[PDB]
Amino acid sequence: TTTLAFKFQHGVIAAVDSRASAGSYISALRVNKVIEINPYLLGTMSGCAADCQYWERLLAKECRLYYLRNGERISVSAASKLLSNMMCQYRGMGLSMGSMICGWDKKGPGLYYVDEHGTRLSGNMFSTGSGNTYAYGVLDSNYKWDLSVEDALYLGKRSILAAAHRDAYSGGSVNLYHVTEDGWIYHGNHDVGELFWKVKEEEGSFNNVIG
Template sequence: FIHILCVGFLAVSSEDPFLTSSSLPTCLPFASSQSVPLPFPMAHGTTTLAFMFQGGVMAAADTRSSCSGLVACPASQKILPIHSHLVGLTSGTSADCALWKRILARELRLYQLRHGRRLSTSGAAKLLSHMLHPFKGTELCVAATLCGWDGGETGPGSRGETTKNQMTELFYVCSDGTRLRGMLFSVGSGSPYAYSILDQGVHWGLSVDEAKSIAREAVYRATYRDAYSGNCVDMYHITSKGWTRRNREDLKEEYYREKERRKHEKTERRDVTFSD
C-alpha cells in the first residue's frame, strides 16, 4: 500500500505543471559538484604592504573591512602576530584569514615544542601553502604575507642592522597554493596605488624612521584612491628582538597634513611670483 502511494505521488508530481515548474532545487548542494551561488556578490578590499630594509621588515595595513559596498568594520586588525618573530598580513575573507592564522600558529608552536627551535619563515610559508592547496577552487579566500626574522638575536653592542643574507624573510602565500619570496609585497585592491610609492622610495639603506614614513605614505595614497581601504593604519617592525607594534594612526590626520603642505607650497609659489 505504501509503495502504491509513492508511485501515485511521483506520477502526479510529474504531470502537475506547477510542481514541474517549481524553482526548488532538483538536488541537494552536497550531492552536486556545482558550487552554491552566494546571495550577493562579495567585494573584498584592503591594502597591506611589507618590505625589507637594513633595519628589518616594515609591515603596514589599513583597518577598513568591507562587505560589498558596506564598511563592515572601520577598526579591524589585518596584521596578526603568529609568534615572537613572525607576523602575517591578511587579505581576503576575514573569517578565513583568522582561522588559518590560528591553525598556522598552533602548528608552529607544536614544532617549537617538539624540536626546541622555531620553524623558519620559509618553512612556515611552505607549511601554509601545503595546507591551503587542497582548497584550491573553493570559496576559500586567503592571501597572506609572512614577515619574519630567522637569524639569531644581535648582541647588546650591535646597531641592530641586518645584512642581505636573508636573516629577514618575506613570503606571499595565497589560498590557491601560490608561494612567492620577495623583498617587497603589497596585496589588496589598494596595492596598485601603494606600489607607486613603494617602488619609488624603498631601498635597502632606509632608516627606521624613513621606512615608517614611506609605509604610512603608501597606505595613505592607497586609501585616498581606493574606496575599500581607509580609516587608520597599523604598522609593525620586525627585527632580531621580535616584532614591535607602532601606535595606530588615523589617516585623516595625514590628509589634513597634506592639505596644509599643499597650501604652504601654493603660498610660497605665489610669493615667488610676486617677488619676480
C-alpha cells in the same frame, strides 16, 4: 584592503589598513589585519576575513608545535610553506586569502607572499588587496635598502595612505609593525582622517585636495 611589507637594512616593515566591506557598506572602521603568530613572526590579511583569521590562527598552532618538538623557532620559509600546503588541500573549494608572512630568523629577515591558489613567493617587497596598485607606486619610487627605520616606517605608512585615499574599499586607519632580530615592534594605530591632513600640510602633497 591594502597591505604591504618590505625587507630592508634593519629588518622588515609591515603596514596595513583597517577597513572592512560588505558591498558598498563599510562594515568595520577598525579591524586588525595583522596577526602576531609569535614574537618574531607576523601575518598580514587580505580577502575573506574569516579565512584569513582561521588559517593564520591555525598556522600559529602549527608553528608553536614546531617549537615544542624541535626546541627551536620555526623559519619564515617553513612557516610560509605550511600555510601554502593548507591552501592546497582546499584548492578549488572557494577560499579567499592573500597574506604576507613577515619575520626574522637565522638567515636574517624573511618575507613570503602566500595566496589561496597555493602560491608561495619569496621577495623584498609585496603589497596585496584592492588598493595594492596605489601602494606600489609610492613604494617603487621611494624604496631603498639603505633606509633608516624612521624613514622606512614612514614609507609604509605613506603608501597605505595613498591607497586609502584613492581606493574606496581601503582606509579607516593604519597599523604599523617593524620586525627586528629581537622581535617585532608595534608602531601604533594611525587614523587616516587625521593623518591625511597632517601629511598634506607637512609634505605639501595632495595639492589637488582642498583643506
